[model samples]
Target: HVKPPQFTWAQWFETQHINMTSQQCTNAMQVINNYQRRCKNQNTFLLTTFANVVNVCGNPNMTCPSNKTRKNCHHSGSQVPLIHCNLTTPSPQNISNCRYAQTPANMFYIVACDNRDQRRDPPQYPVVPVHLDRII
Candidate 1:
């Protein structure tokens, strides 16, 4: 990983997959994973704005523990729109040529937060999404 990647993960996530159209699914993934030059197995894109998604982190009502460990994670109190992009190709195809099957729905999401990991952000946000545990 780029120490202090080209952009913050939050920013990157938004650019890579957020409030996206069904038709843009394949193109967006290719652009973001272009550096790797290979298609990603699968990915879930949140169909909401950054401001809306980040809100789930700072609120105490959404706080929870990750099932994998005792690590802090947050669960959205309400269902958020989402899209899952599944790889359509079996082999590791070129990122530029990758294809994905998009499935859109609404669900609550679990995400690991930065504040619990000691990575604080601006005054406006006490916590930010660092990892998406799952959606249900």
Candidate 2:
């Protein structure tokens, strides 16, 4: 199971100019898409840079020592754009708490898209491991 660091997302978003709205998330997603398309060959590099930008902009703990309220950072030309796309809505009762406990079995959705690669191909033959002594 993949586990994300606690308070990381909150801290990251806080560092960015993201407000409590869907637009922030949407903008971020858009930037991600653009980066993916533009830097397909340099995916690893782009992704790393994007991640850093997100961490720097989103983390709320990051602040200017002199001005507690002011968050000194810039990401205007960064691949990740500021778009409001609220992927998930947090409960008002628990502002800091974000919940995603719903299982996929509980909610099922299907997406249909054209497979441009031509007719669907059957699954490849499974590889079977063989001992050298057994073969001999």
Candidate 3:
């Protein structure tokens, strides 16, 4: 059996953040009630989820684009609206190649970190599912 990892509060926070964000999105819930309930016993899971959410969503220093910022003028004079790429769906074979195509920044960051882990000697699997499971 492998030795238990030398758990660091920081690393634990990072992992929790990614896991919680993914869980939140998956469950389509703003808060995870089960996670909160579980916290009453040990507090580990609660802290983990809290840290995870903060890690994924916290951006204390990030700044939004100012209203005064000028828009790009590539099509300033054109009357036509931007055309939709209509690339929402991809074939099964192409799914892996398109995992990051239109992903949000928080999700993409977690995904990139997971990808890096998988590229290591043991090749860890990504937390996100690449193939959709159909059980009929």
Candidate 4:
């Protein structure tokens, strides 16, 4: 019998960003499988970020990732390159490699955008700001 996909699981598959290996994907499936015996969420369970997903979900591999120094977020993918923005600036004009490099875990990149013109359909003006988590 074929099983339906549910309770999407995640781990630090790669910092290359996006997509997962068959076994890695199935790892979470196993977690869901074991979890379903007691409880479950029919809706999509997000497998985003490290601290939130790790140990929070039933990902056994997530509990004790083999690679100690890989990264926080492992598997993240979309049909296309996802346009996700977090707090990339401190309080506007705040900081960076000044080149949009991958942000550190302590920092976040966030912004709100509206498309007033098709020429700038996504509206990139309000670029994500990065800074310390504790302040700003």
Candidate 5:
């Protein structure tokens, strides 16, 4: 049986950006399988732990344009390891055939945060990454 895709910032972070294994696309896809219905056209993995990535939100380096009403985007203080996984095909029927072309790089990433829940967040993450803006 397949699990229905649910929306959660933390869960998204786990499958999308928080991974130590930058060399294996298959491992990345395995995590994605838990959250998605089919192979994602593209996915990016961050070679760091969740705590490390969340630290960027404590004090953002700069602010950027947010396409919506929630204008709370911030850039990472330093460059972090990143891997871009692009599917070899526009659409893959299943994970078994989900071939990806990985492009790895180190750069500063941008993320949107929910800054209101500082006290409520465990370990007091003053700010929590809710959306991935971009990388530069």
Candidate 6:
């Protein structure tokens, strides 16, 4: 017969999943600091309430849990504040990319600890998205 992990799922959940620190992952929101890689484009995503991310990497569960957990990167530049990338339709592949033009409604904080379990600003999207859509 098949056997369960010796460590127990609960232990893994407590130690691996649902874990968050205070330092922060300013640019690793989408990555969620390795506990899970939300999505490819998810790398630089902001925050959310009902929004959910893809649980890439790691051992996949039967289906999934209610809330697996998350992390973040340090605050970069225009990366500054007040604005962020927003959704136009809600498709993971169709996010606005550049930070939005309007000031962010909610203020986010670093949720992960130091580099041990934290993330850094990847060179590709080195700077966070920022911009307005309306004409000049």
RMSD of 6: 16.8
Model 6 earns a TM-score of: 0.20
* Clash pairs, model 1 backbone: none
lDDT of 4: 0.23
Evaluation by lDDT, superior candidate among 5 and 6: 5
What TM-score, to 2 decimals, does candidate 2 have? 0.19
Reference-based TM-score of each model? 0.75, 0.19, 0.17, 0.17, 0.74, 0.20
Residues 52-136 of candidate 3 have per-residue lDDT tens digits of 3333332232221231132210111112111111122333342322211112221112111112233332223223211101111
User: What C-alpha lDDT values do all the predictions have?
Assistant: 0.65, 0.25, 0.23, 0.23, 0.65, 0.24
Go through the candidates in order and give the clash count of each: 0, 20, 2, 14, 0, 14
Task: State in Å the error of residue 23, model 4.
Answer: 6.7
Please, what are the lDDT tens digits per residue for candidate 1 over residues 1-77?
22235556655555555635445668667755564456677778887776776787755544444456535677778
* lDDT of candidate 6 at residue 27, scale 0 to 100: 29
Which ten-residue region of model 1 has the weakest summed lDDT? 115-124
Query: Best candidate, TM-score-wise?
Result: 1
**On lDDT, who's better, 4 or 6?**
6
Over 3-105, each residue of candidate 4 has an lDDT whose tens digit, in order, gives: 2233111111111122222223223233333433321221122223433322222222121133344222222212222222222222223222111212123
Count of backbone collisions in candidate 1? 0
C-alpha lDDT (0 to 100) for residue 25 of candidate 5: 74
RMSD of 4: 21.2
Candidate 2, residue 41: the lDDT equals 14
